[PDB]
Design an enzyme around this catalytic site. Structure first.
Site, PDB file in Angstrom:
ATOM      1  N   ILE A  21      -8.073  11.790  23.072  1.00 52.77           N
ATOM      2  CA  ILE A  21      -9.422  11.514  21.975  1.00 52.77           C
ATOM      3  C   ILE A  21      -8.957  10.492  21.342  1.00 52.77           C
ATOM      4  CG2 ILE A  21     -10.706  12.435  19.997  1.00 52.77           C
ATOM      5  CD1 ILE A  21     -10.190  15.308  21.009  1.00 52.77           C
ATOM      6  N   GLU A  23      -5.163   8.853  18.188  1.00 51.71           N
ATOM      7  CA  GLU A  23      -3.874   9.140  17.763  1.00 51.71           C
ATOM      8  C   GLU A  23      -3.592   8.398  16.488  1.00 51.71           C
ATOM      9  OE1 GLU A  23      -0.675   6.257  20.023  1.00 51.71           O
ATOM     10  OE2 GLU A  23      -2.520   6.841  21.486  1.00 51.71           O
ATOM     11  N   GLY A  24      -2.595   8.501  15.783  1.00 55.80           N
ATOM     12  CA  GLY A  24      -2.044   8.078  14.675  1.00 55.80           C
ATOM     13  C   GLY A  24      -0.695   7.559  14.860  1.00 55.80           C
ATOM     14  N   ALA A  25       0.264   7.180  13.817  1.00 57.80           N
ATOM     15  CA  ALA A  25       1.447   6.750  13.962  1.00 57.80           C
ATOM     16  C   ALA A  25       2.585   7.732  14.169  1.00 57.80           C
ATOM     17  CB  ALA A  25       1.755   6.229  12.436  1.00 57.80           C
ATOM     18  N   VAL A  29      -4.191  13.235  19.334  1.00 56.96           N
ATOM     19  CA  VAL A  29      -4.983  14.247  19.438  1.00 56.96           C
ATOM     20  C   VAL A  29      -5.812  14.149  20.768  1.00 56.96           C
ATOM     21  CG1 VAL A  29      -7.251  15.477  18.232  1.00 56.96           C
ATOM     22  CG2 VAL A  29      -5.549  14.151  16.831  1.00 56.96           C
ATOM     23  N   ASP A 139      -8.336   9.974   0.490  1.00 60.24           N
ATOM     24  CA  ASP A 139      -8.466   9.004   1.584  1.00 60.24           C
ATOM     25  C   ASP A 139      -9.846   9.266   2.420  1.00 60.24           C
ATOM     26  OD1 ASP A 139      -6.182   7.785   4.554  1.00 60.24           O
ATOM     27  OD2 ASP A 139      -7.586   6.830   2.757  1.00 60.24           O
TER      28      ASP A 139
HETATM   29  O1  LIG Z   1      -6.277  15.502  11.856  1.00 58.49           O
HETATM   30  C1  LIG Z   1      -7.087  14.659  12.411  1.00 58.49           C
HETATM   31  N1  LIG Z   1      -7.332  13.350  12.184  1.00 58.49           N
HETATM   32  C2  LIG Z   1      -6.548  12.496  11.167  1.00 58.49           C
HETATM   33  C3  LIG Z   1      -5.108  12.144  12.246  1.00 58.49           C
HETATM   34  C4  LIG Z   1      -5.321  12.128  13.423  1.00 58.49           C
HETATM   35  C5  LIG Z   1      -3.799  11.867  14.025  1.00 58.49           C
HETATM   36  C6  LIG Z   1      -2.891  11.555  13.254  1.00 58.49           C
HETATM   37  C7  LIG Z   1      -2.704  11.889  11.911  1.00 58.49           C
HETATM   38  C8  LIG Z   1      -3.932  12.363  11.320  1.00 58.49           C
HETATM   39  C9  LIG Z   1      -1.399  11.813  11.362  1.00 58.49           C
HETATM   40  C10 LIG Z   1      -0.726  11.361  12.807  1.00 58.49           C
HETATM   41  O2  LIG Z   1      -1.495  11.469  13.819  1.00 58.49           O
HETATM   42  C11 LIG Z   1      -8.119  15.328  13.414  1.00 58.49           C
HETATM   43  C12 LIG Z   1      -9.291  14.632  14.223  1.00 58.49           C
HETATM   44  C13 LIG Z   1      -9.623  15.842  15.059  1.00 58.49           C
HETATM   45  C14 LIG Z   1     -10.855  15.466  15.816  1.00 58.49           C
HETATM   46  N2  LIG Z   1     -11.209  16.578  16.427  1.00 58.49           N
HETATM   47  N3  LIG Z   1     -12.177  16.390  17.202  1.00 58.49           N
HETATM   48  C15 LIG Z   1     -12.350  15.140  17.392  1.00 58.49           C
HETATM   49  C16 LIG Z   1     -11.231  14.563  16.452  1.00 58.49           C
HETATM   50  C17 LIG Z   1     -10.817  13.248  16.562  1.00 58.49           C
HETATM   51  C18 LIG Z   1     -11.624  11.964  16.621  1.00 58.49           C
HETATM   52  C19 LIG Z   1     -11.363  10.818  16.464  1.00 58.49           C
HETATM   53  C20 LIG Z   1      -9.934  10.334  16.353  1.00 58.49           C
HETATM   54  C21 LIG Z   1      -8.817  11.443  16.258  1.00 58.49           C
HETATM   55 CL1  LIG Z   1      -7.289  11.242  16.428  1.00 58.49          CL
HETATM   56  C22 LIG Z   1      -9.155  12.754  16.531  1.00 58.49           C
HETATM   57  C23 LIG Z   1      -9.037  16.988  14.425  1.00 58.49           C
HETATM   58  N4  LIG Z   1      -8.082  16.672  13.682  1.00 58.49           N
END
Ligand SMILES: O=C(NCc1ccc2c(c1)CCO2)c1cc(-c2[nH]ncc2-c2cccc(Cl)c2)c[nH]1
Length: 345
Positions: A21, A23-25, A29, A139
């Site tokens: 889907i 990602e982050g640092a 996901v 945020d």
């Molecule tokens: O927690 C979620 N998002 C914030 C986040 C994502 C990645 C990450 C951090 C914070 C810190 C280190 O890496 C999150 C998103 C979702 C989600 N559910 N269905 C789709 C998504 C989604 C949509 C767009 C991008 C992403 Cl990463 C996820 C569930 N939890």
């Protein structure tokens, strides 16, 4: 163990058929199939143990989202990790699966006035519950607003959230801040630590403006450039609003600027609903004490089709945590203990 984008995703046997889907640092996901509930879920893999900031954000979010239960707030349905601290290198948080987010939508989709109205209602309904728990999100931005195929909205990412502390909010001019620049309230750059509820309302106002035109209203390119974008539209603060800023460096900076007139909202947004612009004006108020609160925003005529305070629930009790002076090793321990309730044992 299943692999995705060249990384281990050991969530089995309960969760299978993984699809990337975003990602982050310190995380990643994926979508996956829950064999127990027979539904596809979102799984966020986080690897935060190498940096104490990532540990602090992981812990804040896990603690808050485990105590919260609200339709417009992302939940934590399950947590997967190794059975011991030593073997625990990653944490997997099972959450609501959502098709898109408002950042993704705004890049290609024009929103109807009904969609803007409904999205804002759900943001504020979720925000009422967060603020009723004495918690600040800190945020809020379109990428932290998830949407499913029927336009249900859920607020996500509580990594930067804090317990509100309005008595310790004052600070010096140009004080270092972590939250996303374009959604930062003017007082952050002048004299605020972002420890009051008014900081979230400003971000919601920026989101509303972005929904109206598909462009961020204040796209600052660096720290002080952000304040100049805000002042470029709001105009020079009034004598009364300046007199509320006692810090000399912050006040004299504002005084050094040539006079600027307010750009009318109907000039920036000529196709917008007049009631939406009246509410926008109240959320994007320079003075944080004069800025509209979440419950007033919900009662605004613009959201009359949805407003029902009896169907806008609040938290069963305020939130109470101190993670600032805790090492990454001690934070690992608290992440382990907070996620224990989800282990089969
Ligand atoms: O927690 C979620 N998002 C914030 C986040 C994502 C990645 C990450 C951090 C914070 C810190 C280190 O890496 C999150 C998103 C979702 C989600 N559910 N269905 C789709 C998504 C989604 C949509 C767009 C991008 C992403 Cl990463 C996820 C569930 N939890």
């Amino acid at each position: 163990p299943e692999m995705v984008r060249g990384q281990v995703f050991d969530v089995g046997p309960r969760y299978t058929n993984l699809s990337y889907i975003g990602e982050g640092a310190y995380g990643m996901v994926c979508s996956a199939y829950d064999n127990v509930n027979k539904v596809r879920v979102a799984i966020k893999k986080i690897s935060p143990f190498e940096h104490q900031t990532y540990c602090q954000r992981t812990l804040r979010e896990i603690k808050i989202l485990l105590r919260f239960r609200h339709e417009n707030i992302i939940g934590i349905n399950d947590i997967i990790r190794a059975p011991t601290i030593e073997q625990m290198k990653d944490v997997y948080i099972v959450q609501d699966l959502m098709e898109t987010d408002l950042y993704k939508l705004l890049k290609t989709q024009h929103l109807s006035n009904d969609h803007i109205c409904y999205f804002l209602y759900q943001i504020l309904r979720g925000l009422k519950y967060i603020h009723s728990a004495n918690v600040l999100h800190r945020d809020l931005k379109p990428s932290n607003l998830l949407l499913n195929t029927t336009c249900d909205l859920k607020i996500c990412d509580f990594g930067l959230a804090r317990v509100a502390d309005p008595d310790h909010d004052h600070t010096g001019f140009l004080t270092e801040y972590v939250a996303t620049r374009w959604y930062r309230a003017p007082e952050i750059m002048l004299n605020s630590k972002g420890y009051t509820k008014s900081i979230d309302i400003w971000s919601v106002g920026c989101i509303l403006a972005e929904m109206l035109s598909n462009r961020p209203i204040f796209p600052g390119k660096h720290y002080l450039d952000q304040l100049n974008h805000i002042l470029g539209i709001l105009g020079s603060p009034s004598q009364e609003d300046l007199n509320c800023i006692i810090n000399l460096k912050a006040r004299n900076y504002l005084l050094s600027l040539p006079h600027k007139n307010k750009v009318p909202w109907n000039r920036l947004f000529p196709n917008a609903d007049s009631k939406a612009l009246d509410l926008l004006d109240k959320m994007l108020t320079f003075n944080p004490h004069k800025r509209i609160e979440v419950e007033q925003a919900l009662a605004h005529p613009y959201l009359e089709q949805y407003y029902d305070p009896s169907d806008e629930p609040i938290a069963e009790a305020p939130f109470k945590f101190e993670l600032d002076d805790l090492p990454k090793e001690k934070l690992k321990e608290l992440i382990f203990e907070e996620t224990a309730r989800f282990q089969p044992g």
